[PDB]
């Protein structure tokens, strides 16, 4: 809330630490103050939208999704907006491992 202009586009809205388990698709969504070239990077590598990493940015919103999850992709992804940066952390937990335990429900409505 401040009348005036800085010039380029900053992170008005910092992407939110993501938490799914293997197999599953990390998406960050942020928001700009104004539509403009982003660059999402991994720690000390830069990544750019190919098979995997599906880059979709509706103007100021930019999205970067994952496909296929692994407890590896675990990281500190950054992403460099002109001036401004975001990161966030992404934790991958291990796919649930199958396991029978007898149970069933009782009389109980809630």
């Not at 202009?5 to 799914?20: C, M």
């Not at 928001?31 to 100021?60: F, I, N």
């Amino acid at each position: 809330g401040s009348s005036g202009s800085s010039g380029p586009a900053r992170f008005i809205e910092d992407v939110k630490n993501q938490e799914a388990r293997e197999g599953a698709t990390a998406v960050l969504q942020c928001e700009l103050s104004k539509a403009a070239p982003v660059e999402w990077r991994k720690g000390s590598e830069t990544l750019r939208g190919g098979d995997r990493y599906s880059l979709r940015q509706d103007g100021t919103r930019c999205e970067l999704q994952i496909h296929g999850l692994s407890v590896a992709d675990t990281g500190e992804y950054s992403c460099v907006c002109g001036q401004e940066r975001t990161s966030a952390t992404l934790t991958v937990r291990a796919l649930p491992a199958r396991f029978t335990q007898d149970l069933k429900s009782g009389p109980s409505s809630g």
